[PDB]
């Protein structure tokens, strides 16, 4: 049971590390369209196979739900996700 | 002279009827053109297929490769040399060089026997 | 059908069934030039079985249809399309595996000079390539047809191929959908087709060179006569109707002659006729059923009767059998033949009961559907099923399709409980 | 596997392609005959050019236009039925 | 206009295609043998050349010249086509003993 | 010597003719005789014939068993002749190859061509 | 002739709704008259070439596994009866 | 490509305007006469070789950006229907 | 582990023979490292865009019918044994 | 900033083989510079404008088809990445 | 025990490795389900899965076969069935 839940601990990433900081760095290179879809689709995809791996597991005798913890790291890349249309609007406001 | 046997003939490399082949294929092509810089490569291409064509048509158990080279004619010097590793009892080459006041088209034919 | 597992679609699977065609007819197309995959009989012969169940369905299918109205009609126009695409399957198919095999005649070839190929199904098919050149040989016989040739001084002259295809039985006519005004086939199709050479393989040093070539894809037919060593037959032709090839083939043993006088006939392709012109010496022996012609045209050949030969039919008496309800009957019919053709009808099926003709009794005392009996009577050749064109020509009126089926259904509401007699 | 007597009898067929006309080097040749007019009128085509140089380089012709061309997502996709299962029975017994 | 018609190269007929077909026994000749024929070897067959000529000298100072320029190719459609066996057949199957006739019986009798 | 029975028509993959083998290896035979070489009508000839020497003897030494090799080698001065070499074969493409290379300095243009033909 | 249109599942669409329709309408009309996969594929790709600009890709069968990029706005995949049918714009 | 006529998208013409109806007419004639895109930038080359004085260089693509040199009142790119041109003297 | 190369049945190339052989290569690498096709497929298509650069698509599978239009050189359709491969350069 | 992991193929060039290196070299210093092509073939004609005898009109791109008059002995013609650059000169 | 082949959609090489595989099966088990088993694991493991096995003396049958992937016969009083489908 504890191999299983410290195999969830793979994509710690999500919510240990710093979306501002990350978001900073990566508008401060002056990022193209193409690169920011290519980050949008990463974590729609991590967001999407957390969601379809939000599933029961069966340990010998206990059951492991892991709806709570899938649902919550499919927020957290959501939220990912959010914070990047978001620059891009308030960029697309201003110039426009 | 003793006469060759046309079996081994039909299967050995005839290299003046390659050189006839070669001659007549470049002047079907070449003989009255003057170059054109925009006519050379279908001229090359020409030259090509007809010398796979009549070479073909010898209908002889060799695979026929045809290089064809037209350069233009301003007194720079062309050099070429060919060395090649094969079984030279049936095989063959040859070598055509024909010339107008506008161009050189050296032709170089190899049948190798399958 | 789901019984049998037919290895064809029925003629209800429009698109299926098309797609079914013209896959077996990328398969008869396709090129083989350089395997011997194409020179197998059987890899021809598979399809054309599939193509004979196929216009089998498709013939049954149609003969009932020969908004309602509007659906008939073009699923009528369907049958005959599948119709023509099975022939021309099975003349592609034929066509590659001739061409195949003559593709390898420097391995085909045997020591006389004269090969002679054959195969029976249904369908026989037979080749004779006669590269000898033999000046004296006039006489041709060749078993595996059972047919036997007398032939002129141009093929004893001259390096030719000679192809004969009699197809026999159930759907292997269409000149009755295809004849202009009063012929049809009997007793089969016999089409013999003149080859010419095709560009053989050379031979050097057991290396043996193979080009592709037109007439190694597919095969040409060449009308008669024979070029005398160095003509152009297509071409040019005697303008004398040239030396009639005397062909003495076996008819089916289930055709005895009712056209009079006796004719056999050239499928005339440009005139949609069978043209008995050109086709001299007609006879037949009837102790071995056998078709004798002297042929001047070599094209589609066969013996030929009139389609207004029995019309128009001089009258019928359908008596009621199925006792006091309608539950069967017997008509006797003066068709404008001798015997009066009694046929005992019943609920469903109906079965010839006299003439009792060797010939037809295959479907004397057969319990099977009327129509069907019919279809089998014609497979023989027999104008049991005329049309509109035949009815005017024969010079009668030719009653309008309502009408004649209102009266129709009108006497068949009466049928085993009245009198039925025709009307002059 | 070994082959066999009839395999070795097999003939076995052998296909040649006639290739396409591979070209092969095409030198960006800058000569014509002088002794010929076909290089007098590349010649005068030379000088045109020079001439045409000249008239760009006399005065302000060398304004040249912006060309902003500005003229992508990879999704994974899986078509299974994925439903197999290999059951043994006996009957009757 | 005429200038590409004229510098547009076109295949004058269509590539032949030959088959040569021997018997598998054939094959592998030991007779086989590879050697080495040198370009002084082949001087009077390969070895060819253009001397420049000196005195004619007609070499000029090309200036105007066009480039076919290709980039990346026009893009050919391609139809792929994967297909296992031909659409199954159904069948009759219904267990039924088979015995001798009983011609044979009355044989061994 | 081997029999018919176990005697492979086609070459294995790793004694097939590598094209990118071959144009590495004239275009190290081009590089070693060429650089920094002004033309020179007498020794074209001569520089020709050792750059198909070399070009073969490598090949030779490639070990690609019934692999018949044909090496051309065309070496001219740059003078700015329109030059157009093509060229057309007829063989069977399943194992024969091919490949070829060039070489230009100030002063002379070079194409090295290498085919090989598998022998049956 | 009856309308075996069979009810169209849309699995994964970066689409327009009426972008959708057409796809799903084109589908239709190239299984009933091709169902040979690539003959399908090819008049759904040829139909939208001709109405949405060159170039799209399609992809028709039963068993296949592919990953592909797409223009946005520019991908579907479904089903029609049995059959796979995917379209996406690329290039 | 072949067709009848496009519309030329001009990002920008250095140019006269009687010319530049005349680079319309002659890409337009180059599309129906030709099929290649370096057939269409000859055609259109050679026209204005005729027309307006050679020499004049043409490009025919899908995706490229490029900067070049020519002489003023004779520029101009244009996105001809699927096709971009830049068409400019320059010698 | 026993080298069971499936040998690829070259269906339908349209390349050089070294990069048809690096295909094959990495097709086999991706059939020893998966066995879902569109792993196989992302697979081929990233490691053909890390040394051919994006954007290549890679199909596999068994029974499908593709009509997609690839650049020139940039396309193969084969079989490494039961397993169809289609790859080509779109976008 | 950018660049392209495919070996420089030189189609053909009007210029020596050195010319070539330093057209590559300059070719990639634009990749790393700009990331528009756009961008990219106008720093290598600034490039080889103050160095290469000016003007060397560059194109940069991935499609396209043309016929220029390049000035001799200032010509090229190479493919890198998934660009092809055509680096001539014509002022 | 002569194979008495009832219906074949086959070719006559793997008939005959049906027929040596049926009569292995035979010899090594007793029980038709298990004879059944090996002849269809023998036969993936040979021709391409997925084929299916129904061995007995007693049923009747109608189920749809893939082209020349297709067998019924009888190996002494015992009706051996084979057809290849999915």
């Not at chain 2, 090359?44 to 350069?71: D, G, Q, W």
């Not at chain 3, 070839?109 to 033999?134: P, R, S, Y």
């Not at chain 3, 003495?248 to 009712?258: G, H, K, S």
């Amino acid at each position: 049971v504890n191999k299983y839940a410290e195999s969830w601990r793979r994509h710690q990433a999500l919510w240990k590390t710093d979306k501002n900081s990350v978001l900073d760095k990566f508008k401060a290179r002056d990022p193209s369209a193409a690169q920011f879809e290519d980050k949008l689709s990463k974590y729609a995809k991590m967001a999407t196979e957390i969601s379809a791996q939000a599933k029961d597991f069966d340990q010998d005798f206990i059951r492991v739900s892991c709806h709570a913890l899938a649902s919550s790291v499919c927020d957290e890349a959501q939220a990912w996700v959010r914070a990047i249309a978001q620059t891009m609007r308030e960029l697309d406001a201003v110039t426009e | 002279m003793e006469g060759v046997d046309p079996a081994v003939e039909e299967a050995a490399f005839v290299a003046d009827d390659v050189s006839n082949i070669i001659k007549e294929s470049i002047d079907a092509v070449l003989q009255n053109q003057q170059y054109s810089e925009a006519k050379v490569s279908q001229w090359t291409s020409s030259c090509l297929e007809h010398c796979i064509k009549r070479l073909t048509a010898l209908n002889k158990p060799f695979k026929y490769v045809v290089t064809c080279i037209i350069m233009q004619k301003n007194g720079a010097g062309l050099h070429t040399a060919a060395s090649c590793w094969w079984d030279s009892t049936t095989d063959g080459s040859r070598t055509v060089r024909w010339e107008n006041k506008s161009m050189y088209c050296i032709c170089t034919v190899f049948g190798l026997a399958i | 059908r789901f019984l049998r597992c037919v290895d064809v679609p029925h003629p209800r699977q429009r698109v299926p069934l098309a797609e079914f065609l013209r896959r077996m007819h990328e398969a008869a197309t396709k090129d083989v030039t350089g395997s011997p995959d194409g020179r197998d009989l059987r890899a021809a012969f598979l399809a054309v079985e599939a193509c004979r169940t196929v216009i089998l369905e498709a013939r049954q299918e149609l003969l009932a249809a020969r908004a309602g109205g509007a659906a008939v009609a073009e699923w009528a126009e369907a049958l005959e399309s599948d119709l023509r695409t099975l022939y021309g399957i099975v003349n592609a198919r034929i066509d590659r595996l001739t061409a195949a095999v003559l593709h390898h005649c420097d391995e085909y070839a045997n020591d006389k000079n004269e090969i002679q190929l054959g195969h029976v199904a249904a369908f026989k098919w037979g080749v004779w390539v006669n590269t000898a050149k033999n000046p004296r040989l006039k006489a041709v016989e060749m078993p595996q047809l059972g047919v036997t040739l007398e032939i002129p001084k141009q093929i004893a002259l001259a390096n030719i191929a000679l192809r004969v295809q009699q197809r026999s039985g159930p759907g292997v006519d269409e000149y009755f959908s295809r004849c202009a005004n009063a012929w049809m086939a009997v007793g089969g199709l016999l089409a013999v087709d003149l080859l010419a050479m095709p560009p053989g393989a050379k031979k050097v040093r057991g290396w043996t060179l193979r080009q592709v070539t037109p007439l190694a894809l597919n095969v040409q037919r060449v009308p008669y006569p024979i070029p005398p060593a160095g003509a152009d037959p297509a071409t040019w032709a005697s303008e004398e109707e040239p030396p009639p090839l005397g062909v003495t083939a076996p008819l089916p043993p289930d055709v005895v002659l009712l056209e009079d006088p006796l004719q056999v006939a050239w499928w005339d392709e440009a005139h949609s006729i069978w043209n008995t012109d050109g086709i001299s010496d007609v006879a037949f022996d009837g102790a071995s059923k056998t078709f004798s012609f002297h042929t001047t045209h070599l094209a589609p050949l066969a013996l030929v009767m009139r389609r207004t030969r029995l019309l128009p039919y001089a009258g019928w008496a359908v008596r009621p059998t199925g006792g006091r309800n309608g539950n069967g009957a017997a008509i006797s019919l003066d068709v404008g033949l001798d015997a009066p053709v009694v046929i005992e009808v019943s609920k469903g099926a109906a079965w010839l009961s006299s003439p009792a003709w060797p010939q037809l009794a295959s479907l004397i005392g057969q319990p099977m559907p009327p129509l069907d009996l019919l279809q089998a009577l014609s497979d023989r050749g027999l104008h049991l099923l005329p049309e509109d064109r035949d009815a005017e020509a024969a010079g009668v009126t030719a009653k309008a399709r309502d009408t004649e089926e209102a009266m129709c259904r009108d006497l068949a509401l009466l049928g085993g409980v009245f009198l039925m007699a025709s009307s002059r | 596997p070994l082959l066999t007597e009839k395999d070795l009898e097999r003939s076995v067929y052998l296909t040649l392609h006639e290739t396409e006309t591979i070209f092969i080097w095409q030198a960006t040749g800058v000569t014509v005959a002088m002794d010929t007019e076909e290089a007098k009128l590349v010649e005068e085509a030379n000088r045109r050019y020079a001439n045409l140089l000249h008239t760009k380089h006399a005065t302000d012709k060398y304004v040249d236009a912006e060309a902003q061309t500005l003229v992508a997502s990879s999704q994974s996709m899986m078509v299974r039925p994925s439903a197999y299962h290999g059951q043994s029975m006996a009957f009757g017994a | 206009e005429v200038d590409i018609e004229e510098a547009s190269v076109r295949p004058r007929r269509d590539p032949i295609r030959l088959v040569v077909q021997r018997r598998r026994r054939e094959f592998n000749q030991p007779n086989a043998k590879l050697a080495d024929k040198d370009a002084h070897e082949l001087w009077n067959s390969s070895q060819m050349e253009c001397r420049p000529f000196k005195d004619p000298n007609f070499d000029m100072r090309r200036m105007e010249q066009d480039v076919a320029v290709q980039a990346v190719a026009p893009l050919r459609d391609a139809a792929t086509q994967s297909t296992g066996t031909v659409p199954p057949r159904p069948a009759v199957t219904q267990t039924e003993p088979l015995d001798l006739p009983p011609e044979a019986k009355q044989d061994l009798v | 010597m081997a029999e018919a029975a176990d005697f492979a028509l086609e070459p294995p993959f790793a004694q097939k003719f590598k094209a990118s083998r071959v144009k590495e290896i004239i275009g190290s035979v081009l590089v070693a005789r060429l650089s920094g070489q002004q033309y020179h009508a007498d020794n074209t000839s001569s520089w020709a014939r050792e750059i198909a020497d070399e070009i073969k003897n490598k090949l030779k030494e490639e070990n690609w068993s019934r692999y018949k090799y044909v090496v051309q080698v065309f070496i001219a001065e740059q003078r700015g002749e329109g030059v157009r070499l093509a060229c057309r074969g007829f063989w069977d493409p399943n194992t024969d190859n091919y490949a070829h290379d060039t070489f230009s300095n100030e002063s002379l243009f070079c194409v090295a061509t290498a085919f090989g033909v598998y022998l049956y | 002739m009856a309308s075996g249109s069979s009810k169209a599942v849309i699995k994964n669409a970066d689409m327009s709704e009426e972008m959708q329709a057409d796809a799903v309408d084109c589908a239709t009309q190239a299984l009933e008259k091709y169902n040979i996969e690539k003959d399908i594929a090819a008049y759904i790709k040829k139909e939208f070439d001709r109405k949405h600009n060159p170039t799209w890709h399609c992809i028709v069968g039963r068993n296949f596994g592919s990953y592909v990029t797409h223009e946005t706005k520019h991908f579907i995949y479904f089903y029609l009866g049995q059959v796979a049918i995917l379209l996406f714009k690329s290039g």
